[PDB]
mmCIF file of C-alpha atoms and ligand atoms in Angstrom:
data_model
loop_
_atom_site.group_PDB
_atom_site.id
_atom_site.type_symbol
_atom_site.label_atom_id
_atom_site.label_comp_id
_atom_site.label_asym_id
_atom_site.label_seq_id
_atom_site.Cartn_x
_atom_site.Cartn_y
_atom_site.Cartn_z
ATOM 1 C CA UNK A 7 97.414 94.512 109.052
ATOM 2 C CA UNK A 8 100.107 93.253 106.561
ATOM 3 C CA UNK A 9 102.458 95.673 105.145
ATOM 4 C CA UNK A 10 105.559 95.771 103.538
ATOM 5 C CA UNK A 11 108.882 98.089 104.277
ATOM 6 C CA UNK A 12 111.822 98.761 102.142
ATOM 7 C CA UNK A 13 115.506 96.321 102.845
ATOM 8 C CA UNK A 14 117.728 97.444 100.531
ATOM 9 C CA UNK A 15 118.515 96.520 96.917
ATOM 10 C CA UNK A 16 119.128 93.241 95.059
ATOM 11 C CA UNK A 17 122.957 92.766 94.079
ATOM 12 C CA UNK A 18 125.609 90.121 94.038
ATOM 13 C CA UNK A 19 128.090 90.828 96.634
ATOM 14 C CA UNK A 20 131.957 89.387 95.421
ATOM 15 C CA UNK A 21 132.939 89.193 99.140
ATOM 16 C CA UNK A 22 129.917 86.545 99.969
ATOM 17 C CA UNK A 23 130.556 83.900 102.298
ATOM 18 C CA UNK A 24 130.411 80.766 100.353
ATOM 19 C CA UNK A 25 128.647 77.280 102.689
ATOM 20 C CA UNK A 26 125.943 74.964 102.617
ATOM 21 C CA UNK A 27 126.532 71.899 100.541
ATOM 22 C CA UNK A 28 124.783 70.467 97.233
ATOM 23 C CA UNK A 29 122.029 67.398 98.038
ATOM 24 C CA UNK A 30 120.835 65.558 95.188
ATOM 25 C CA UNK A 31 117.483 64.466 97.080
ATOM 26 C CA UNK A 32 114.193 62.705 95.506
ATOM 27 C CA UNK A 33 111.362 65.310 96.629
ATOM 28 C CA UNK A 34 107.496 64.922 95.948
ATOM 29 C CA UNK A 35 105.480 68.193 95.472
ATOM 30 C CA UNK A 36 101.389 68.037 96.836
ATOM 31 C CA UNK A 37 98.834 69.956 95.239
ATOM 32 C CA UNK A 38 98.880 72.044 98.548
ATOM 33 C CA UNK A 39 102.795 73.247 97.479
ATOM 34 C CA UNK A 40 104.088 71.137 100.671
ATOM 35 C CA UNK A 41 107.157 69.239 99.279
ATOM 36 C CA UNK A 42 107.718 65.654 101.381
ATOM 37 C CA UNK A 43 110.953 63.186 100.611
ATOM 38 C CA UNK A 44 110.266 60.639 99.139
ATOM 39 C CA UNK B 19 106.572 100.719 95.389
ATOM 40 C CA UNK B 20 110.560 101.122 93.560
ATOM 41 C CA UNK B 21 112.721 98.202 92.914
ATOM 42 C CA UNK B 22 114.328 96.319 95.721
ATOM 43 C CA UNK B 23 113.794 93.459 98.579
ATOM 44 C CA UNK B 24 111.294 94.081 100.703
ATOM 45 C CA UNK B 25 110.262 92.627 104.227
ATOM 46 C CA UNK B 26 106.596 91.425 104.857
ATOM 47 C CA UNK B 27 105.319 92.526 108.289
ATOM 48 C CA UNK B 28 102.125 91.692 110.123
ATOM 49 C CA UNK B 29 101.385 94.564 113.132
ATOM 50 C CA UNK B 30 99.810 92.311 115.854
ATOM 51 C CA UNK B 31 99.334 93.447 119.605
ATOM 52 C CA UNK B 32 102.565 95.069 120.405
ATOM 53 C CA UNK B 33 104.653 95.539 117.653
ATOM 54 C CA UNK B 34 105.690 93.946 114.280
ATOM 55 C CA UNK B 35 106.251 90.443 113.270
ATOM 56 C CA UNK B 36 108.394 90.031 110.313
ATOM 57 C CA UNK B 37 106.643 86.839 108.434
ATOM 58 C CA UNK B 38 108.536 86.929 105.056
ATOM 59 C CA UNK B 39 110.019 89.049 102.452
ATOM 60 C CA UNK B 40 109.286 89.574 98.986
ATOM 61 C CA UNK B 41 110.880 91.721 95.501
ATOM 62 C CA UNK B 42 109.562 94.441 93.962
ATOM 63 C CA UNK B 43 110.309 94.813 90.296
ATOM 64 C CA UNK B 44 108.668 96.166 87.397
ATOM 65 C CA UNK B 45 105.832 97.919 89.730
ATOM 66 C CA UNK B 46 104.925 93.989 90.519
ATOM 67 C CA UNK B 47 105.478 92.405 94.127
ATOM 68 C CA UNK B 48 106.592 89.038 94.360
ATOM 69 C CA UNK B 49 106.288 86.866 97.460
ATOM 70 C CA UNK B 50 105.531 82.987 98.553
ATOM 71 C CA UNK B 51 101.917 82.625 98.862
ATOM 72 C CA UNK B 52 102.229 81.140 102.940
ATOM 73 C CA UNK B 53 103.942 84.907 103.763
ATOM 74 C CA UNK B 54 100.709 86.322 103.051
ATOM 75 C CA UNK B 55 98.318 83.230 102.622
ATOM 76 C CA UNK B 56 96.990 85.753 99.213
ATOM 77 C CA UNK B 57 96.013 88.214 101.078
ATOM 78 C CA UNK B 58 96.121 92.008 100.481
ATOM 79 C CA UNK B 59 99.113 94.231 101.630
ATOM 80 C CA UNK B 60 99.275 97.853 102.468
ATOM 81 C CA UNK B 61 102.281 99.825 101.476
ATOM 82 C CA UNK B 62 103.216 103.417 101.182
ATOM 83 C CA UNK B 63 101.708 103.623 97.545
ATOM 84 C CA UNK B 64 98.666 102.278 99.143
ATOM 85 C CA UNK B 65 96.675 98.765 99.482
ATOM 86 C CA UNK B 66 98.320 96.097 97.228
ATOM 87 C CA UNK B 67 95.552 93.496 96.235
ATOM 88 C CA UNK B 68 96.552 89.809 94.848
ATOM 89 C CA UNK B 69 96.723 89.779 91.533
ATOM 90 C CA UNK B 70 98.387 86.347 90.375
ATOM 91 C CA UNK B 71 99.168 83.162 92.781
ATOM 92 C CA UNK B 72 99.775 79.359 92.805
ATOM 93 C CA UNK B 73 99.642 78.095 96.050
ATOM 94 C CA UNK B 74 101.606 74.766 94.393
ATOM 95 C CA UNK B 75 104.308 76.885 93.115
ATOM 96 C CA UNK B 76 103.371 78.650 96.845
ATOM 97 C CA UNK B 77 103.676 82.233 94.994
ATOM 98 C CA UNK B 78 101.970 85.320 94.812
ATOM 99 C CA UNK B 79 102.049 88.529 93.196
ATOM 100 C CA UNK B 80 100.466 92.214 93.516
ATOM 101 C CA UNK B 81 99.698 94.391 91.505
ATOM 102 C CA UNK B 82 100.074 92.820 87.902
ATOM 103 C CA UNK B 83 101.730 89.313 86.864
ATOM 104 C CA UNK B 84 104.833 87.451 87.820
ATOM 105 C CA UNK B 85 107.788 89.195 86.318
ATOM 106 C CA UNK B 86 110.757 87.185 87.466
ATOM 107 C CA UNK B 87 111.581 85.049 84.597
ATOM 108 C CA UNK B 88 115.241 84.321 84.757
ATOM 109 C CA UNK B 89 116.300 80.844 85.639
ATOM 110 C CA UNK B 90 119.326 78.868 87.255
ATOM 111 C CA UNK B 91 121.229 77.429 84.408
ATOM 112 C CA UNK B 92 122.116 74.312 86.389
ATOM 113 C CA UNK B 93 125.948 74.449 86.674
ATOM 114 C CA UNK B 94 126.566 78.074 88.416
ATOM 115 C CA UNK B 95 126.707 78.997 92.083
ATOM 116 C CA UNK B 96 123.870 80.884 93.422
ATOM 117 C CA UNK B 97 123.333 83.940 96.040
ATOM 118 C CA UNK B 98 120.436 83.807 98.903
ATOM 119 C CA UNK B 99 119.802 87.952 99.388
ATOM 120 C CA UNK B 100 118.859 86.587 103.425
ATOM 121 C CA UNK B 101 116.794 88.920 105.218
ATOM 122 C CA UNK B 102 115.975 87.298 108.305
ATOM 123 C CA UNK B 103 114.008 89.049 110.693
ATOM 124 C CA UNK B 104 115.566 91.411 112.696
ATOM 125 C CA UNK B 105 118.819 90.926 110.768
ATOM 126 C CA UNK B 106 120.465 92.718 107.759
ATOM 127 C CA UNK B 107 120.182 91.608 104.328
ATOM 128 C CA UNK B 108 123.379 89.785 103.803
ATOM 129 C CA UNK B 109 124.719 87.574 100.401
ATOM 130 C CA UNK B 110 125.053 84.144 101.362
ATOM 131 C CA UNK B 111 126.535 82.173 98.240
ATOM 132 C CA UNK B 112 126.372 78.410 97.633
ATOM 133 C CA UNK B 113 126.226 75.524 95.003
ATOM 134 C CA UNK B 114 122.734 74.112 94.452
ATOM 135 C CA UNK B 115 121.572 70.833 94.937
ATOM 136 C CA UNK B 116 119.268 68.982 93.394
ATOM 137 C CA UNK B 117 115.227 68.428 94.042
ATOM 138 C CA UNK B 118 114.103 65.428 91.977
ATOM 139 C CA UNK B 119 110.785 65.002 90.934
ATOM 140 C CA UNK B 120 108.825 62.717 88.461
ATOM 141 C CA UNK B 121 108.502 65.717 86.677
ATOM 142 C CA UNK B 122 111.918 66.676 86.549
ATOM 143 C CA UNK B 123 114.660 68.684 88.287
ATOM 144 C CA UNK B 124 114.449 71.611 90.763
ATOM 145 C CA UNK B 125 117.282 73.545 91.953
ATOM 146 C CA UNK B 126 117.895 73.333 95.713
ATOM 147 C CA UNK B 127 119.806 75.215 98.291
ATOM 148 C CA UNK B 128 121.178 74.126 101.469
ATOM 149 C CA UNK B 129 120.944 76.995 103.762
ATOM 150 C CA UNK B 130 118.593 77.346 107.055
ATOM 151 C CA UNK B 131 117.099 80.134 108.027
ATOM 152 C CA UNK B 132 114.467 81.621 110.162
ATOM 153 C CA UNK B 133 110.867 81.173 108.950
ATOM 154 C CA UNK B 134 110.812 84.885 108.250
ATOM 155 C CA UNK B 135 113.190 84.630 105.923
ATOM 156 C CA UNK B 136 110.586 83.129 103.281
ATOM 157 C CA UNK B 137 110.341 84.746 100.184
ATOM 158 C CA UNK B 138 114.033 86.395 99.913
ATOM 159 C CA UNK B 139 115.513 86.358 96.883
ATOM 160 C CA UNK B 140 118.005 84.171 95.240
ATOM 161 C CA UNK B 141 120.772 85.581 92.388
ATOM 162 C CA UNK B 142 122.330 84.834 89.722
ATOM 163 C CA UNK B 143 125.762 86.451 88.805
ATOM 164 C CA UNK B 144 124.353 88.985 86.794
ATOM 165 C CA UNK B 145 122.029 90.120 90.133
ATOM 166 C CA UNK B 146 118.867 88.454 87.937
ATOM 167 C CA UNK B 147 116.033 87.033 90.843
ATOM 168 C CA UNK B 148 116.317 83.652 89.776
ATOM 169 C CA UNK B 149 113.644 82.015 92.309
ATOM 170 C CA UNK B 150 112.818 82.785 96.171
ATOM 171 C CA UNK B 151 113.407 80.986 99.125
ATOM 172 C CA UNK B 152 111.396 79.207 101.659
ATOM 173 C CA UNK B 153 109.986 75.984 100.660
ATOM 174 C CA UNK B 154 111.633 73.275 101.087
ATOM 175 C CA UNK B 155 111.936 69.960 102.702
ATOM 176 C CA UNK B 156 113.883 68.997 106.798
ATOM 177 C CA UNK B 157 116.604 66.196 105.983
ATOM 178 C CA UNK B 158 116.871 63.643 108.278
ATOM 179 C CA UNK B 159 119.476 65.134 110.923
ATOM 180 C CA UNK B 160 116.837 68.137 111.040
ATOM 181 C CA UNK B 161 118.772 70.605 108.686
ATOM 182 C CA UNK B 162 116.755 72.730 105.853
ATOM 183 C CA UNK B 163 116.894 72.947 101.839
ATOM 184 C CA UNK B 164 114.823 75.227 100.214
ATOM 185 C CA UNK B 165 113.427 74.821 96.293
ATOM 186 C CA UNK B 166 114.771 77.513 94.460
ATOM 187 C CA UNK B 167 111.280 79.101 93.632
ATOM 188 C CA UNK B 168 111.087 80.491 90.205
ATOM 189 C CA UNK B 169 107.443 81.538 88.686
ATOM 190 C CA UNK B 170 106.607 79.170 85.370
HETATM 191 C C1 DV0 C 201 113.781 78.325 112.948
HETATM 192 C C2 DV0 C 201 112.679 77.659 112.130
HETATM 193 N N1 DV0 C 201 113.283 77.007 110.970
HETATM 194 C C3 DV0 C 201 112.452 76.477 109.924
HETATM 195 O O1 DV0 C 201 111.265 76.549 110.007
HETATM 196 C C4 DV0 C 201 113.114 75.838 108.705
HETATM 197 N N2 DV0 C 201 114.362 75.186 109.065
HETATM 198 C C5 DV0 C 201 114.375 73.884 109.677
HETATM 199 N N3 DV0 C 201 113.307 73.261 109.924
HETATM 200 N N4 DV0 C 201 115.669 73.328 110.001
HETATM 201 C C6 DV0 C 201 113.498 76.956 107.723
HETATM 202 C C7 DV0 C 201 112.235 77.655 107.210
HETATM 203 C C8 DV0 C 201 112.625 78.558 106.029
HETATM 204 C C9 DV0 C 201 111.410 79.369 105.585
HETATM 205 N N5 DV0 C 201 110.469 78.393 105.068
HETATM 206 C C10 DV0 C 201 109.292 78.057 105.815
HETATM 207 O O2 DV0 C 201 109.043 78.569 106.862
HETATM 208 C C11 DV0 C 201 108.414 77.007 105.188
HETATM 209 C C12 DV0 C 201 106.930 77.353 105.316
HETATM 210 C C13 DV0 C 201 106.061 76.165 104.906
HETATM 211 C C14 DV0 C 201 105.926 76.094 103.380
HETATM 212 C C15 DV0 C 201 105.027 74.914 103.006
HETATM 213 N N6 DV0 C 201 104.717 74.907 101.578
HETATM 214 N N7 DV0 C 201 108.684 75.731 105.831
HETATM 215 C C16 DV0 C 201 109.296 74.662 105.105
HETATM 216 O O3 DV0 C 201 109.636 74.798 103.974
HETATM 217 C C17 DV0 C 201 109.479 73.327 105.794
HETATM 218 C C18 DV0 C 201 108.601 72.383 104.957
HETATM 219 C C19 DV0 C 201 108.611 70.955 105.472
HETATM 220 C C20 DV0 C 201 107.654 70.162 104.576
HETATM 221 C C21 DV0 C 201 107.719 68.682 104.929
HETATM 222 N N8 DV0 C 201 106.728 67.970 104.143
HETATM 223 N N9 DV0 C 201 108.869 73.296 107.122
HETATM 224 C C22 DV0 C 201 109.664 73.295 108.328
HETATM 225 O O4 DV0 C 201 110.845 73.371 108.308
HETATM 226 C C23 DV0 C 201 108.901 73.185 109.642
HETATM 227 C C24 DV0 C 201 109.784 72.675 110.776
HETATM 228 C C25 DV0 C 201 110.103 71.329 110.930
HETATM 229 C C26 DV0 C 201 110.898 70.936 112.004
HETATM 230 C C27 DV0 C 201 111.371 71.884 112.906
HETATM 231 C C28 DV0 C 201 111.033 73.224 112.744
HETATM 232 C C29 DV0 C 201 110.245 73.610 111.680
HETATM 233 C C30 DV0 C 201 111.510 74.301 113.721
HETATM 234 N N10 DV0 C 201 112.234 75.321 112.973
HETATM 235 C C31 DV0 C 201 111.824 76.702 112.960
HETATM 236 O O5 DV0 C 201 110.877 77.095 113.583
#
């Protein structure tokens, strides 16, 4: 009931909007993949 | 089953659900294992059945073994290929943060998106899949940054 369909194809656009800023933050990582801040 | 970005769909009741994305390269697909929680995916080369996963790393791959292998080099701005459900895939570029661990360094990008979104692919300048998107940690005004993903 899962299926996959095609979205396009994997390049670096020049025009990209550019946002978001740069965290330096101290992360643990569980055995179940959940990360949690520490 | 040819090279690109791909969204994950489940079919439900009435219509599709978008619940990730993933990249197809080298005949291999490559997703986060909570899109698909491992399981097997249908496709118009057929049924795609789970052929390598880590559900620390939370990734999964069909059809043979993880095939991304380039890397961040820690300095250079990044690309998130977004495809959020119901959305076009659009290029959203940014400077990575860090996630620190006790076992060292993860790349991290600031950018929120819908849960759908999971598994889209990151850049590098060169257009190389450096890692995929979608697990990450809520900061404490309730914004989102998401490991950059990369199969060890
Ligand atoms: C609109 C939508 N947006 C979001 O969900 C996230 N954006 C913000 N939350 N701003 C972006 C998701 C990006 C795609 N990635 C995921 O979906 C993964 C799947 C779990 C992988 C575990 N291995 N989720 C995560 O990585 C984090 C992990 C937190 C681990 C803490 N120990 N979980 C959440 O954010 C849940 C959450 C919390 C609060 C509020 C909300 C949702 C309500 N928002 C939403 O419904």
């Amino acid at each position: 009931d899962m299926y996959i369909e095609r979205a396009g194809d994997i390049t670096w656009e020049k025009d990209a909007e550019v946002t978001g800023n740069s965290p330096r933050l101290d992360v643990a990582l569980d055995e179940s993949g959940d990360f949690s801040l520490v | 089953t040819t090279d690109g970005v791909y969204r994950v769909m489940t079919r439900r009741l009435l219509g599709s659900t978008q619940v990730g994305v993933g990249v197809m390269q080298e005949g291999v697909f490559h997703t986060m294992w909570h899109v698909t929680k491992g399981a097997a995916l249908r496709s118009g080369e057929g049924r795609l059945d789970p052929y390598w996963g880590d559900v620390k790393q939370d990734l999964v791959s069909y059809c043979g073994p993880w095939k991304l292998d380039a890397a961040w080099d820690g300095l250079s701005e990044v690309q998130l290929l977004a495809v959020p459900p119901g959305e076009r895939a659009k290029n959203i570029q940014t400077l990575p943060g860090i996630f620190k661990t006790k076992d060292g360094d993860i790349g991290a990008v600031a950018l929120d998106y819908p849960a759908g979104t999971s598994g889209s692919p990151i850049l590098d300048k060169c257009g190389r899949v450096i890692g995929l998107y979608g697990n990450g940690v809520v900061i404490k005004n309730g914004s989102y940054v998401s490991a950059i993903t990369q199969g060890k």
